[PDB]
């Protein structure tokens, strides 16, 4: 799967690590995290992540 980058801060999502401490586990694609996810290195939501395009 491909990892997401939050525009606002840099964090990149890495769908093999997932966000366990915040619910998604690891294995879990960016569309598939819940919608109320927010990064957990500054707070926006997901509508800020741009998809990392290899
Ligand atoms: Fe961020």
């Not at 990149?12 to 819940?34: C, L, M, R």
């Not at 957990?40 to 990392?52: L, M, R, T």
């Amino acid at each position: 799967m491909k990892k997401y980058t939050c525009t606002v801060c840099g964090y990149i999502y890495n769908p093999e690590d997932g966000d366990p401490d915040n619910g998604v586990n690891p294995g879990t694609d960016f569309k598939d995290i819940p919608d109320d996810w927010v990064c957990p290195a500054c707070g926006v939501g997901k509508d800020q992540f741009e998809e990392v395009e290899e």
